[model samples]
Target chain A: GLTIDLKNFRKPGEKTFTQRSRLFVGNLPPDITEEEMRKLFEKYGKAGEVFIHKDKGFGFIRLETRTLAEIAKVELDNMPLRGKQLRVRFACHSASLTVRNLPQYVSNELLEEAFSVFGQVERAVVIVDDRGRPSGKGIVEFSGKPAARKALDRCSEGSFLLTTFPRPVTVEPMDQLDDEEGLPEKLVIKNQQFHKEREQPPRFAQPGSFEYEYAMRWKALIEMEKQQQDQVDRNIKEAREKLEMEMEAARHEHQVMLM
Target chain B: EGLTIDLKNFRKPGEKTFTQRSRLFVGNLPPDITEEEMRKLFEKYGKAGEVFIHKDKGFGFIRLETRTLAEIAKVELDNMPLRGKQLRVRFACHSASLTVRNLPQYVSNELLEEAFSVFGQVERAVVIVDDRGRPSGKGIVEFSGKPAARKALDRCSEGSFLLTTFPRPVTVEPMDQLDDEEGLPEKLVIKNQQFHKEREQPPRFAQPGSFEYEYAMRWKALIEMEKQQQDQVDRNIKEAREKLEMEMEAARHE
Candidate 1:
């Protein structure tokens, strides 16, 4: 009764298979047997190898193809087996896109939002120059390869345009870029500055002086008490705001009902 | 002539304990600094126990015999230049202690201890009080070990335990070092410069006849007025709904 029509998706010149075909299944029941897991995954495609950790409540499975693995993940993720919800995900490296010729004003958050239209964005970072200015380059990592492939396809066809940044931008797979390209020079300079500042000796009162020491102790005590008082005040304010919100919502609901 | 006395006997029941303050948190350690160097540096002031240098973290902890010795070492070594870095020394946090909040005003120290004791053995529990000895809705629970404190925090955070005296759930968090100062000396006389504790005064804005006070009064009055109006509306809604329900029921009956 289980059948997967995979003949239509096969490619002649596709790269040799890799661990990208593997899937990580987590939040499994400890008592779930290996044979049971294998049978569950075989419903999607030809399950190659199934490794189950009985005590750890997690296992890994390799499928015949990345497409089959993706199908299995979509079908099985959050699906319950023996009262436990399965967390199915790809075990391979996430896909990342290196975008070049970005606007200097584009931040990591902005880039993430712009690329999120395709799929789930894991992380987005914009490389900065020595002056803390964006270097007109950024990287966007996707949770899966499908989104990256889609974005890259659009970029290559000249159809991808960020409305906020009207300039032409280029995108390449991070694996294809040179290893030395993504490192930021600003981070190196900042690290050096931090080290220099860390080595400087702290200014203290005279070694054998009592007046300064007493004064410092008193100041520390006063500061500590003040901090404690401030924390109490903050907690009270937070609780009050929460209560006020609830009351306001109730009031609005009552008024709406009367109307 | 020698007069010897065991200082431990002087500690009275319910007094603050200083046993956990022997460990000192050493910060700003050089990457290359070793445990041996740290031990040697602190050995002059007190007998060092465990010298753990986390090379990756660039910090370390050195344990001493007593709180007095730890304090002496902190005073001597804090901010002292060491291997091209200024060392930061302070009393390490009491890992077994946890700060609990959102407690009801009626919750007592015994009740707090009983509530948390389900996870593990509680060493001590105290409900912090204000100047008038009223519960401040905050308390500290010191467990027998760090594991128990961690377990309590995890259970409370995961909602495994419905830890509440009132309707609101209590918040359990690791106690900050600033609030854990039971080991600190209450008063000190350094070279005849007597330093004593001063009463903590409220903020300047809390005082009467201040601009902030007037503004706060007006804000409270506005909130009170709004609350009263909302209450009136709620009552009217309930009466109107009941009347409509009765009218509909009578029509259906007829």
Candidate 2:
């Protein structure tokens, strides 16, 4: 069960994947409209256009300047729209590295300091408990994909953050990075899997073995897509079911109160 | 060791505090008000030296040419309305930094500076750069003095704050103690979800015999009433069909 590595792709800060003056706002509540987003974003700067995908419940916001976009994203990422926590990030995708099994009291600065030796550390956050103590897990964002990949490779044996951090803390690329478009790593994986044969051959492996391999690889890709699609479907279904149940309970209780 | 030396504000130990009072505290100002505006606003009370605006901290400070002007400006600007918000003006405190806790993970350095700049002149503002070096929802903002720090603590610590710097409410305090565990709380306190609406869930199915059973019976009765209404409509349709058939037979006989 090897997770796909994203290191084989072009790093961010490249001409194709550097910064942009656009941001993706996700998990927006249906009650919020495009005009509301425009008004809030315009306060930071002149928002060029606000696109709300009613069916998808997410949208892109275009700002006049990259600086304005960054500031707006940072300021509005967690802001509530119609009682829903909004997820905002730059429209340009950057690969992020995740570090697990950190020591307690691993502050964000501590995490950044450890990772900075490799390259430009954009930001580091140690997931802390409610008491404000590190939970031995953190994520680091790099200015470029090279920096993130370097950190992932360099910290594989254990993090260099400090001696206090437990040895053998796992470092790897985030799984969500797999969805990145035009990944050389993904292409390599697909090509390699096409030629490589599995240890335990199935019924279709005799004469049409190559065909079976391609079919399995295709099925893997399809399954990944289906899982992502299923997750969204499950989330919406759960929310609607929960809403209906809550309404029913309220209605029943109200009747009892009246009785 | 101090026979010919100075310590407090680099003067003498006989002084009340170890820090200077040349910095003026300004608070509750509009966020868009610029550093130039801040310097100009407080310059009338005294010769303002340097105005450091922390954009996310919603406060900042101004250094006066002398301690006297700093104090003078503090009193004059007290309760003065700037951009419709009453200013909380005072002599900036000795402590120059504030360690803010419980920041929502998304809070960034730019946001921190923006939030505190309205309070006083800030030297530097930073949030926890999580592994990605972005805001990890915790931060520190360094201002000129203790009064600014104290005022921030006094105002923000009060419930129902509208700082608007962070989506989640942030707590601020003067970094007075040197304890390594200052920002890291020893106890992890569970916070009630502020945005979550209170919802009471009822049973999907009631037991055969209980208070809930009566509810079930009422539901059944309502369904039975609908069923009866439907049966009445069915009977009317049947009678209309019979009448139509009888009329067709009479027409044929004629």
Candidate 3:
């Protein structure tokens, strides 16, 4: 085998990955296309893998650097896209990590305090049952992936306590439930190339003409709202299509029997 | 002259005519002493008027309804202890003001007092602070004697850098009409002008567990759940009512 110095061997323009350069894109429209999502993100930096959820209205984009992610989060958060406000955030946890078999005395505050010893805890919710009671399970969200891993490492050992309950806190990676359905698709961008004005929205969209276009912009927004309001939910659309396919199948079965 | 009721003069034997000087200076006051407290102290002399308390200076100026009351207040509160400190009461100084600018950020009240006291007896040495409680680059110092204030200004204007740690020359200009309708008119005008412009708006997101955010989001989730439950109840009630109506109609047809 030939020995090669991999550290300094760049043949040409190669994209480099930085620490925690992932961003979460939420409140997406079901009809959002991959190309559309990529086009929106490529303005900030060289966007890498774009994983759009098939059924759910959320996704993640892997950027080349943390600076680009920060800029994008600031610029695009709450920006209206697909007739809904987009929630752009620094992808904190992969959904959330699960902590099971908790003592009834453990509250959200207690859980947060315990978990914060590892790192910054975003949210800690003690799950409650339908009878308005503690369900002995909870979800803990951390601001960083490394923090989550550290917490999981300690809690998974089965004897984590200090809150006077004397019982070990149960912890595990969260399982994807039926309600939290999302088909993930990972696409690789080989060159990591992006154009500044790919869409080319307007002929005269400079700063000077911003106020001039604002009136028409408002009118267009109103029209878009009306159009989007008439659309059905993604789940409902899928169910209707499934029903039609089943009906067609039954009709074909009857014809085959007659033959 | 000491007869039962002197018909020649209706005035008391020891009484003297008092000029209507309306304004009086109060010193050695605590910062927490409210305008109401000052009003309560001086209102018996006459119907109280405006009380401008410069909290940082530990001093204030009050206007009485009449000069007679102002004189009476001057005599009463000249050597009294207000909030455990000996209070100094005298006629408000109209010409003993000096506007000091370019003060270093770290300059303290005691240092300022020491600096001004070297020239003459300082009535007050107040360093103004902005809304965030950081010192502005200016202050107002009052002295009992105009000549002493002039001498201090002359000395400071010559060696301004020595007076401040900022290594920059400080401006020590004489201010006239210090005790007007509002105390320190020039400084007040500048401060008010700045106040007119709005400050920058804060970022929209709330720190997690902060009061409004946690309460609002929690209540929102609860409301949404309740709304869904109510919708289900309404649908069930409608279905039952419709079934009853259909049965009645079928019976009528029979």
Candidate 4:
């Protein structure tokens, strides 16, 4: 019998892990969007992400923790979407995610120049690896939330997208994250987006990012969380006080036992 | 990995007829084994169906086409072998309607007829494929109810799962109000006989293949009608029959 090869199908830094954070949600419609997804799962808990093709048809969602993932999987797996039965599960394995067939005309500058329209580009690269590969493929990392969703929306199924210039709207998840260093290697600076990109970037820089700005953001979020809690709590407290007052007045009239 | 078809959002309460008591077990399975080997291993005192090696998982699941087939398989291949692995065979299937599992994912009607050439007069069989045009890794093979599925399962160890036994449905659940919101019935209030238009009969499997689009449209219409009505529908079977006949006649002329 011939042997079957299972190669770079896994994610980087996740080799030993049998369980990954990814999940498969089948039976999706063709109209759901990333923002809508955020809203849908916010009911359960903090939804880390619901990624891929903006076509409401089908997609994958990631929960912040395996705990929540398991809950959703048990409760919603095999649920229906649109007019079809759904299959939701912590996928045993994931297919490789990568952008293939790099455009012959587009270069490093074009790659960076194109994606910078959405968000900050950490890097963009196109290269083949140790297999003495022919070049044709690009990988890009997004610095903004919209960048990831935007890229996934337009890049699913490897369909060809049309563009005004040579730079086409192309972005996909990197399936084989093994050899990431050698890539198309393009970085473009978005001149216009920089004005708003400044405030978050500096404080987000490095070492103290967590202890400083993140803490402040956490505090702000905690304040919001507290407000939500206070509304219900105060309402309950007042209701209890009103009930007690009514009960005392009734007791005074009836001349029942003392408190 | 056990693949899922990621099947259609079919109406819930949907069930394929035929169930089976088949089972597949894999571990230290010896190769170059024969039916006798499986018989001696699994059914020592009775008759046997057919036996062979598994193709995909590289293990064997004995097909007990008859009740006695199990006894024979258990008694025969308990420790028999070509290499040193002790043969482990057990109940393969009894109507799970999964003979399709061994069949190729794309075994449309034409392809199915071509492959089962050894077996005479193929009546009906299906290889379940998913929306991605990939096989759902399962199928159903019916032959004169002569228990062709059991016979095939015995020696049909071509892929992941094997074995065949008593009657069982492809899949089953109670028929009533479906639990899903989206699973509107395909055809509302149609009588049991109405389903005689076996989903397998198709434009998809026919010459010109364009008939599939029409068939799909018919299904869509049925689904829409179901959504519009909400209750145990008491459809006039005679009316439904006339409609089906008309559709069939139109298609025949077309």
- Candidate 2 lDDT, B55-162, residue by residue in tens: 687688877654434433554466677887888775555566777865533333554566677676665566544333334445677666667667677766543232
User: B104-165 in candidate 3: lDDT tens per residue?
Assistant: 44454444556688788775566665433356656677675678788887876444323432
lDDT of 4 at A48: 54
- Which 10 consecutive residues of model 4 chain B have the lowest summed lDDT? B160-169
Considering only chain A, what is the TM-score of each predicted structure? 0.35, 0.38, 0.38, 0.28
How do all models score by TM-score? 0.30, 0.25, 0.22, 0.21
After superposing candidate 4, which stretches have Cα over 4 Å from the reference?
A1-21, A25-35, A42-46, A52-58, A63-92, A95-259, B1-132, B136-254
Clashes of each: 0, 52, 0, 63
Which model is ahead, 1 or 2, in terms of lDDT? 1
Question: What shift in Å separates residue B188 of candidate 3 from its native position after superposition?
Answer: 50
Return the lDDT, model 3, position A62.
78
Candidate 4 residues B129-238, lDDT tens each? 43333445454444433455454454333211211110111221111211111111222224353233221121111112333333323333443444343222223333
Query: Model 4 scores what on Cα lDDT?
Result: 0.39
Comparing only chain B with the true structure, the TM-scores of all models are 0.49, 0.32, 0.37, 0.25
Which residue runs does candidate 1 get wrong by more than 4 Å?
A: A1-259, B1-21, B30-36, B44-49, B65-69, B93-97, B102-117, B121-124, B144-147, B157-254
TM-score of chain B of 1: 0.49
Chain B fold agreement for model 2, TM-score:
0.32
Residue A179 lDDT, candidate 3, scale 0-100 = 11
TM-score of structure candidate 2: 0.25
Q: Considering only N, C-alpha and C atoms within 3 Å, which residue pairs clash in candidate 1?
A: none
What are the per-residue Cα lDDT tens digits for candidate 2 across A1-259?
1111111112112112123556888998876787877776755545565789978778887765443454456457767778788878776446567776554444556566667777877556666543445556677767678887777766542224332111234577854321111111122223433233221221222234433333343334434544655655566557445544543464455436533
RMSD of 3: 34.7
